Amino acid sequence: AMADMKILRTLAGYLWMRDNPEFRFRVIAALGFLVGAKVLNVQVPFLFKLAVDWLASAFATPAAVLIGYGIARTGSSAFNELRTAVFSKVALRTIRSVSRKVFSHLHDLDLRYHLSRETGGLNRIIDRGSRAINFILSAMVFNVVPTILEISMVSGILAYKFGAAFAWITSLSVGSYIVFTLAVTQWRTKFRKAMNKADNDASTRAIDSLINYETVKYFNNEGYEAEKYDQFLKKYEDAALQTQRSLAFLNFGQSIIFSTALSTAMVLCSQGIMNGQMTVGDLVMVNGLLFQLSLPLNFLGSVYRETIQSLVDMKSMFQLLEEKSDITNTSDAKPLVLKGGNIEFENVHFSYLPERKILDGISFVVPAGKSVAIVGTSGSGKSTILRMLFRFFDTDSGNIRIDGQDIKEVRLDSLRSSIGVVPQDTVLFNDTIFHNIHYGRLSATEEEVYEAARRAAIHETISNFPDKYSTIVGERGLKLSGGEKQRVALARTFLKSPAILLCDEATSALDSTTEAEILNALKALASNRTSIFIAHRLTTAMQCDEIVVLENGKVVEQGPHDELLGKSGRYAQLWTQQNS
Amino acid sequence: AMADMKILRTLAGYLWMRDNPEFRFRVIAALGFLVGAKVLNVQVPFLFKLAVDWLASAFATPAAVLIGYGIARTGSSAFNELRTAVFSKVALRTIRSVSRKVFSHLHDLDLRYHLSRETGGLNRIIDRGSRAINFILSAMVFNVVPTILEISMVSGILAYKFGAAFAWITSLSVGSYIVFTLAVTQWRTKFRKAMNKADNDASTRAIDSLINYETVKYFNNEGYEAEKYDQFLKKYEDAALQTQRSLAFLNFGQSIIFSTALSTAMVLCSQGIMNGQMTVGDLVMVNGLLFQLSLPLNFLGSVYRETIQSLVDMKSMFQLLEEKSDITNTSDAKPLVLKGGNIEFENVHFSYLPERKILDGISFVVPAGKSVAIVGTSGSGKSTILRMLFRFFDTDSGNIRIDGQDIKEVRLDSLRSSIGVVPQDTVLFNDTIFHNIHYGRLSATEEEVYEAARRAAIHETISNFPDKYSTIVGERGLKLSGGEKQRVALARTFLKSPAILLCDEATSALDSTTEAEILNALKALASNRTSIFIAHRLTTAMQCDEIVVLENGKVVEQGPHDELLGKSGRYAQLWTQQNS
Ligand SMILES: Nc1ncnc2c1ncn2[C@@H]1O[C@H](COP(=O)(O)OP(=O)(O)O)[C@@H](O)[C@H]1O
Ligand SMILES: Nc1ncnc2c1ncn2[C@@H]1O[C@H](COP(=O)(O)OP(=O)(O)O)[C@@H](O)[C@H]1O
Ligand code: VO4
Numbered sequence A, B: 001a002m003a004d005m006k007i008l009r010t011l012a013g014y015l016w017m018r019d020n021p022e023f024r025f026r027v028i029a030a031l032g033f034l035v036g037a038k039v040l041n042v043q044v045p046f047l048f049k050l051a052v053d054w055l056a057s058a059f060a061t062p063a064a065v066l067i068g069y070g071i072a073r074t075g076s077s078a079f080n081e082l083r084t085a086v087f088s089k090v091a092l093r094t095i096r097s098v099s100r101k102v103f104s105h106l107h108d109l110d111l112r113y114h115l116s117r118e119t120g121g122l123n124r125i126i127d128r129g130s131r132a133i134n135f136i137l138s139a140m141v142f143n144v145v146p147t148i149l150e151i152s153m154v155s156g157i158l159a160y161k162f163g164a165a166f167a168w169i170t171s172l173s174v175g176s177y178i179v180f181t182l183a184v185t186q187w188r189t190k191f192r193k194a195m196n197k198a199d200n201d202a203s204t205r206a207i208d209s210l211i212n213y214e215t216v217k218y219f220n221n222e223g224y225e226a227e228k229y230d231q232f233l234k235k236y237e238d239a240a241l242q243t244q245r246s247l248a249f250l251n252f253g254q255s256i257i258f259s260t261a262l263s264t265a266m267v268l269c270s271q272g273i274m275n276g277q278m279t280v281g282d283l284v285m286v287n288g289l290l291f292q293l294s295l296p297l298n299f300l301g302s303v304y305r306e307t308i309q310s311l312v313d314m315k316s317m318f319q320l321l322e323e324k325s326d327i328t329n330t331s332d333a334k335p336l337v338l339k340g341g342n343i344e345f346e347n348v349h350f351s352y353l354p355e356r357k358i359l360d361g362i363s364f365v366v367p368a369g370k371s372v373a374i375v376g377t378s379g380s381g382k383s384t385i386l387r388m389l390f391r392f393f394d395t396d397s398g399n400i401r402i403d404g405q406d407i408k409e410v411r412l413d414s415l416r417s418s419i420g421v422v423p424q425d426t427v428l429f430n431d432t433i434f435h436n437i438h439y440g441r442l443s444a445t446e447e448e449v450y451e452a453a454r455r456a457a458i459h460e461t462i463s464n465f466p467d468k469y470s471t472i473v474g475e476r477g478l479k480l481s482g483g484e485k486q487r488v489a490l491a492r493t494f495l496k497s498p499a500i501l502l503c504d505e506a507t508s509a510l511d512s513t514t515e516a517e518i519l520n521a522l523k524a525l526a527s528n529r530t531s532i533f534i535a536h537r538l539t540t541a542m543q544c545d546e547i548v549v550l551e552n553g554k555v556v557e558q559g560p561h562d563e564l565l566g567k568s569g570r571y572a573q574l575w576t577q578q579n580s
């Protein structure tokens, strides 16, 4: 309950944004436009009644009255239609601002929220909530107050010409109506939540199946996905069908309470034909007044039903907005200043889950201007150090140091800009290859981009393409070949030119002859700055000065290439079979 | 225009599905429920008027009349609410069937449509269209005919008591109203299409940015995505703002034509106070009758506006449904029968685009029970043959033969089941690893799955996991390591056990010591059936009997390992530097 109150308060603050004085003029103009129509709408029946009465008692004068009636009809519609134009602008501006803020916060969220997300549920929630905000903004300003005022006016009219029992009857009817409506809305709130949960799951299942299109084409199991989607759609079918019947119960209950209220009103007055109310003029008055109470009352019931209905969909975003990143910067942060690349590890211990410990007692030092290569079993978690060094996941009980400085103390913005890393799996934007290669540094010019491709051994291949530097790379970089996709990612790091180089499985999908050229380029440019290369191939680690072997989360042997081969350790066995 | 007529005809056929006799009973019940309410609704004012007139001329009899008035009010609402329950069921069933058919056709579509799709536009279109069908189904059955009948009845009532000019005035007003409404709807149709196009682009851009989360976290360029999303949202803002004002023009035009029609009606009758219509009773009659014409007429205008509005969103799916796969099976197809794996190529020529030719004059033979390995430059397009052999893309001017049979003539279903391929890039479902490894063959039992993992060198690693055979693999298999993800894909092919094995970059992210065990398992199981291994590493091709070198789309050297080394060709140079 109090969570919804915070949601309404936050939305209300957006409407009354103090920064823009134009919005203040815009909102008050629409309100005055509504009250002007409401006053004129009341005046219209009075003008018509006066003309009819005057004509009955009795030409230019009726014509002017009929002309004035013409503008009155035009004026009532003119005020209403001209009112919604302004509020539409302010509501749409609020929609855009809220969507942009949600987008920014979603990208601000931590990595642990990702890698386990429901792809599709996020966009479905965003669309559903963005559709919901417009109605809540539109209805709240113009509908709640005038209807209550009209209800109060009609209540005062009915209080006039006291019947000494009609007030009690209508109070009881109103109380019963409110109780019934609140109970029905509270019951129906549960059904919408069940339907919403099923809809997101089907969408994310469909999107996952679409992502697995290559696998479901390689394997003949195509009907299984259709069957699962049919089951999810059947669940959504049942959830939606339950809601529709519940709506019919509310509508039937809506009429039955008013129908018996009208019946008991006519019965009560007919019971007093003699020794009581004897004027038949009052008989039509009570019927007309009750209808005049019914129409605004029915409008109020729809407004609350739609508001509580639309507010349920709103809880989906704002729960996501309350999510906070686990990793946060220190209250006092020092900018990262380094004159050389030195990395030190002091008994780092880290675990993805409390049950299993991946890293245990790993300690190594990276001298400035030197390259260190780590090799080992694929299950040893060698790449976890590279991910942890980038501070994707914070350390538990270990000390990590760069140039004699605390990485945790150092600001994240400064930390994530001095070093550059080549991803193990290359992902490319669905945009031009020129944009993909220029994403490394937007300040770079065309000459810098072209020379970077030459050292990546890709400019010659690009020159032979039908569209030089303009081919459209497909979704997730599927259109380009594996090797060329690998070369593109390396070119981004080359253009970025970071202080510390961290390549992860660089020469995996690359032929032998091109790898020799790439390694020579690395050993010339990266002489003055430290780098760390990780790869199972023995040829890339041979050139490195220092080689260590990591297995089962603990370092085994350290030293240069010559010492490792002589020691006849784990490294020697790996190189022996590779040479063959 | 005629395209929309086909769309309406297809939707109408779903409602009258001949297979289910229950639907026929369901639709006719609702129609009879509506006409019963309509007849009773007309009777209600007559009953009230009779009671008032009888009471004025003049108790148990009025009480029974008021009681009967009570059921009349209850009966009118009971028929209407009980009507919508059945049609909701049939409409939702139609929705589910249409969504399932669209899902199936989308997965039926060809590969060329994929790999260049707009991820997100598809789901947004599906959601928008699925929301649109319900209103069109609901409104068409119950709204078009009764409103026209009521309009005709009121037109006949106005034709009664001829004024000799009111019929002409109302005919002119109706014609002008229809012309104005059609013109406004035709003009507004363009605005909706512009808004719809912008919405899909923003969604697909956001989803692409979410997919590129790792890259936008590795590189500090985070604000660029927000700026692009803001620009797209601003375009959608402008497109939506243009629509809202156009709606206000229609509504203002709605009232002004009726307001002047009422004004000229009152002016015309007031002009004939003398020497004409002198009874003031007719003055209120024309006013009441005009309002009785106005309410159904306004309802008709809203129905057409909503129908033409919702039909624009419908064109999005049905254009996609008309899409047909480029590759189709032959009219007469023979089941694939083979006693051995023989593959023959006869001057195959294939090109992704007409500008560049990738494959030119490639001819090779794969003997039964033998393994052939191809190596070369990454840009030589060696993997295109494997993709083409699976008939993802049809050949242009080449002959491809399996066991002396035409692959094109052989049915696609039979062709895509005899052979199995390991993808170059491994994609895993967002489900349990047990389900991922069991996807190879649903008929396999638990024992077959467990023994398959042992030969994949992954059971030992899985046993040490916190959740044995129950860990949840993340989206696109990001949670698991590269090596373990590679091993999982191999286990699927092992469980499938196809007649022809085709591995693409199998031992890429795998340490040396595990690769020796895997290769030994391959050489024992795959002795009786042919296989093709492609990889840049020289150790995997050494064991193969026949080695060929493919560069620049043409074969260079062929023969066993010993002959290739002696020839001092391209293969010798590649192996020389690898040995070092
Ligand atoms: N997202 C994850 N969730 C659970 N366990 C993980 C995850 N990533 C890695 N591991 C564990 O870490 C080990 C591999 O570590 P990783 O850093 O992936 O090494 P590499 O990348 O060199 O294969 C595996 O045994 C696996 O169980
Ligand atoms: N989807 C594609 N669109 C355009 N060109 C492509 C596509 N896939 C491959 N190519 C071209 O084919 C060559 C690589 O072929 P490919 O079969 O990817 O070989 P490999 O997989 O061994 O790298 C590249 O030079 C590239 O230009
Ligand atoms: O040249 V490949 O992308 O098939 O390793």
Ligand code: VO4
Pocket (backbone or CB within 6 Å): A377, A378, A379, A382, A383, A424, A505, A536, B481, B482, B483, B484, B509, B510
């Ligand atoms: O063991 V790895 O997945 O970093 O090649």
Ligand SMILES: [Mg+2]
Pocket (backbone or CB within 6 Å): A482, A483, A509, B383, B424, B505
């Ligand atoms: Mg490859």
Ligand SMILES: [Mg+2]
Pocket (backbone or CB within 6 Å): A383, A424, A505, B482, B483, B509
């Ligand atoms: Mg790896």
